[PDB]
Amino acid sequence: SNLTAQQQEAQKQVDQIQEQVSAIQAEQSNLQAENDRLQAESKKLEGEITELSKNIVSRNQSLEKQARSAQTNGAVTSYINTIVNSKSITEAISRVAAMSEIVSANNKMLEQQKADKKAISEKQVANNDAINTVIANQQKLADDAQALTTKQAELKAAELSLAAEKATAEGEKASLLEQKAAAEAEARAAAVAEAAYKEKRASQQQSVLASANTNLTAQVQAVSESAAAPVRAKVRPTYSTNASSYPIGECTWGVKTLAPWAGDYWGNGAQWATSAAAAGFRTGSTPQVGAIACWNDGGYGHVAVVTAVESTTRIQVSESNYAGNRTIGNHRGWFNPTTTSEGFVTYIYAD
């Protein structure tokens, strides 16, 4: 080699910084590649979780209908007597043998339900861990991009410093020493930027963690305390506390009795949601316990108060004047409120 001692020192600074630069770039490619495959694992797990979810919900309903039919009490006693309905001279019995198959099919169903609940649970943790890793990697990538900008600026200046030590000229040493001073100033700018980045990142996270010091009630309190605070309910009218405005036994009289917050002159049940909306009440398509269910059939319609909710297509209700019975109470048990002869259902909420 024709290398000097001073030139080797400059070469060492270039090789050290280049090593750091390549190390950052290698990790960037490493993390970006890991994220790509983890995002793919997640997508696949997500599709499988969706598949299991609908099956679990569907199978639960089937298992609850099959339980109800197998545990109705009043009709089940006859199903136990059907097995006993065979002893002496009845030709050929295949009722008891067929009873084993429906129980075998039943036991097979809950075992598959148990397996699906196990599988979705396992797929959830793996998916969640994959998603968490990807976010941590993305944060590491953001940190590396700032570090790379700094180290590449340092490398530039170091390479110019090496170019000065090699220079076989008085004219040129001076030229690239001006360029080195310029490059070193740029490297300082990059470092100060990275310092501000770390400074900002740290305080931002502390500000995020500080906001966790709260709860829902305080959060809901802040809405009503603000200017944009629910004041649409202020313009409502004070209604009567009794049902004297509705005739005895009617569905309207019944709902007014159970839900005294309803209006006094809201007419036929069919029009209650229409009048309630005008009065400032919130309406919607999903049942809530305590909400007034309003069915519109283009005629008189019907109203009731929701007493229990399992889904949008499965509720219980307390009502008056259903199928000729004018007493207030539970007339139907569980039923689907979207598929009745009273028509389009809409719910009126208290708040």
Added chain:
Amino acid sequence: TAQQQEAQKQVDQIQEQVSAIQAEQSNLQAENDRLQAESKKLEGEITELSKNIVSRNQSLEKQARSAQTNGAVTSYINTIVNSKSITEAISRVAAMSEIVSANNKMLEQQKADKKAISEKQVANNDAINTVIANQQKLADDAQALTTKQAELKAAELSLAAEKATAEGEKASLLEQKAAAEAEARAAAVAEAAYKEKRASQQQSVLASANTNLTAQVQAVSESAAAPVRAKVRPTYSTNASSYPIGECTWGVKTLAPWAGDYWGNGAQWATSAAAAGFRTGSTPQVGAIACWNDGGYGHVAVVTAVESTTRIQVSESNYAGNRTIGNHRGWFNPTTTSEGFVTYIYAD
């Protein structure tokens, strides 16, 4: 004579009652027909006013709010000072009077519609009530008419006996009178049974009013079944360590600790919640987890206020770059956002 007048008096008294019932039947039936028509017309007008009132309310809240949004009003005061620059014929301040005139005209029409619907509601309600009372009166009259017409029959035969002839015939229609009087007693016993039934049925109805919602809801859970799908629920962690700091999932888990621990990207929370046994739906409720699915990562938040399906407030984390938990948007429409299809997960 004299005895014949007494018989004639009984016929005329009962005939008077019979005609009175028939007159009232025609009276009530005619009143019901026109009241049912008045109701139908009022119903159509109430529907017309209702949609206008709701629509106009939304319009009135989109207006005024945009011209009185805290932060934005200072610019509206500067607009008059900026339009005052002499270049060169100014009609910006004069045109500002027209939008305020149009605004004031809108709330005055809203106030008139709320007044009109209120008046139409009471008239309609009274009309409906009157019709039902009349129908009950008509049912009572039909039973009374059957009785009085049977009494009239016997009374007319009694008069026919006093006019005599005499045969041969007195004895004949006195047997018919005794038969008619027995029929009249049968009609009376039938009307008594009718009143007996009507009275006890109404008492049974009035007895059922002695209740309230809580007792009603209690009877459902006390019955064989009875919501028992929530019994199989799981114990989730009480902290948000399973979700990364600043993410929307971490924020919702912080505000709604009843949510799951490994429910992944916000988009899939409703899907996992439904599998876990939670109830989901399309209408916002305060305290519900709003889950938006965009076919990607999606988003989650907790509903803090609800005015309608298309107007809510929420508290969330990581919205538009801001990773702190809080209110980021104010009032907004959750169905029309870049995070996609909204679904709500309810606590119970």
Added chain:
Amino acid sequence: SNLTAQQQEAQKQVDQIQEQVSAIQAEQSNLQAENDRLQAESKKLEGEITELSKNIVSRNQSLEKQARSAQTNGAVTSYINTIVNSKSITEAISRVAAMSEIVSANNKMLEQQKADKKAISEKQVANNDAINTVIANQQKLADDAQALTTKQAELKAAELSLAAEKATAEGEKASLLEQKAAAEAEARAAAVAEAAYKEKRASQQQSVLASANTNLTAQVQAVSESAAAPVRAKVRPTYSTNASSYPIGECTWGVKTLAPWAGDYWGNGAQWATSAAAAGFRTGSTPQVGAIACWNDGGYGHVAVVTAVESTTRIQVSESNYAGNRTIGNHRGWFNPTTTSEGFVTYIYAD
């Protein structure tokens, strides 16, 4: 017996008519009982048909996703190479053994799908036959009620005729012979009513069968030929046939190119449904081929033209300016239009 010859003749008429009366009443109870149990069989079959239907639809989607993943072509070649990725010194392989289980699970799925399609088919015919029998019985019950009214009126008169032949009195024979003449007149009235019933029933059915002499086109023609005929589309404006009102490459320009019946000044894609509705176009939530899909995100939104539809949550579309690509064409393949970053989807229909 102290029975006369004439009295026996009267007694015979009573016994013959009573036999007919009891025969009708016996059949009424017979048919009413059969209908009750057939209505119950139907209800049970209906619930089972609903159960099978949702499973068949759900399982079809799963089988088509599992087929797609197992028949993607470009990624499947790697799945065939994974089995070949084992020969000499690889420790323990359970990738080929696990491949048998997913195929076993796949083959088990289509066999259960085939069994469910077989079961629903069988349950459909049994249910349909049960429903048909119940309607035929109801028609027979309507016929019997008319016949019963007639025969009971005949019985009344016959019993009075017997009461006249027994009568041991000059005073009473004459009385119940007047009652018999009255009863016979009532019996004639009942017969004439039953004749009118049969007369009406026969001609009504012929009038119903006559109305079947038609088809949809004639039916749709009669609507437009009537006074209540679609004339809301008359007030529309004639739009330009080119997309010069929209800038090159935009989504609006693309939709206008493929659907020239769209408007010229409808602005950002998000507002197209809003302007279309004002212009008199019909809008809705379900995709149709040739409909303009309008997504509203509270911003600029997006528009496209629907090119294929499998369900509400699965369509294909041709569009312009998707994910940076400004050419008109198919960018996404099959996708769910309700779950995208462009927001709330609404469809604008040509008619």
Added chain:
Amino acid sequence: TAQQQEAQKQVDQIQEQVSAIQAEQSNLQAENDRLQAESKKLEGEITELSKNIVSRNQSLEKQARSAQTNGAVTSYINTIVNSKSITEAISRVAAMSEIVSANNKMLEQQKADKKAISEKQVANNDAINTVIANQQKLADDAQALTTKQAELKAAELSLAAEKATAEGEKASLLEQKAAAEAEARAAAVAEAAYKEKRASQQQSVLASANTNLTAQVQAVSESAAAPVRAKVRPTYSTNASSYPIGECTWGVKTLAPWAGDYWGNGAQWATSAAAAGFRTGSTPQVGAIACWNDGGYGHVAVVTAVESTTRIQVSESNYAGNRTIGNHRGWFNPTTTSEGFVTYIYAD
């Protein structure tokens, strides 16, 4: 001198071009800001007018139609002749003028709103178009500015050489000029590549316009998949012998022979159709089978005309006791009937 003026001229010419670009950048950016604001305001007003126009159209069709329903107008002519009976101060004919005045006022406001939305649409559309054109011009200017500023640099160094001193220095900044001119050439080649790319991209976009819907739909079916779910469909009977005469099912089967043969009560038709591979949905289309489910027997019909989701006509059998096939209701709302939840089954 003289040579220095030539150098000064080159600096002043290029500086003029540089300032012209920068002036236009500020000009276009300012115009876009105010046009984006005009658009936002117009958008809100278009939304306001749209809902009013749709709402008012429904109101106008519920009105007039009720006062001009064939069969019902003869009674409206008799109402003036019946209110003319002298009993005793008549204000029924005078009040009839007010509802017609209110009606005529409604269509005049509808006509004004259709005029206003049309005008607002063109102004908004032109505003949006201008903004996009400006954004493209801004992208072009940024590339041109980079080039002209590089040319200016070299020209200023050329002027600095002619002023000289002279050293020692002429030679120094002539080397810098040669370096600057090389940089200016690099900027020009970059702008050329930009124009090269921009031009070919637009040609590729314009090329894709050479198509139509049919070719587009053809490419879907020609691709790997391609709707092939309809391939597995079944051959049903061509007559309605499987359904009893006069029933709603028999009627729909007669009009829509593509329906199934053993689909039972009308209520379950959508359920069986979905299992059979047919597409279902919540929006009416002409020729679709409407299936109403009331938790009981339900009802079916064939859609013959559609105005909206809440306004259709249908042809059906066995409606309100009438078992003939035909139009029984005219225009009606299929979501608000006593037959329950409506769902439509589509042919394809």
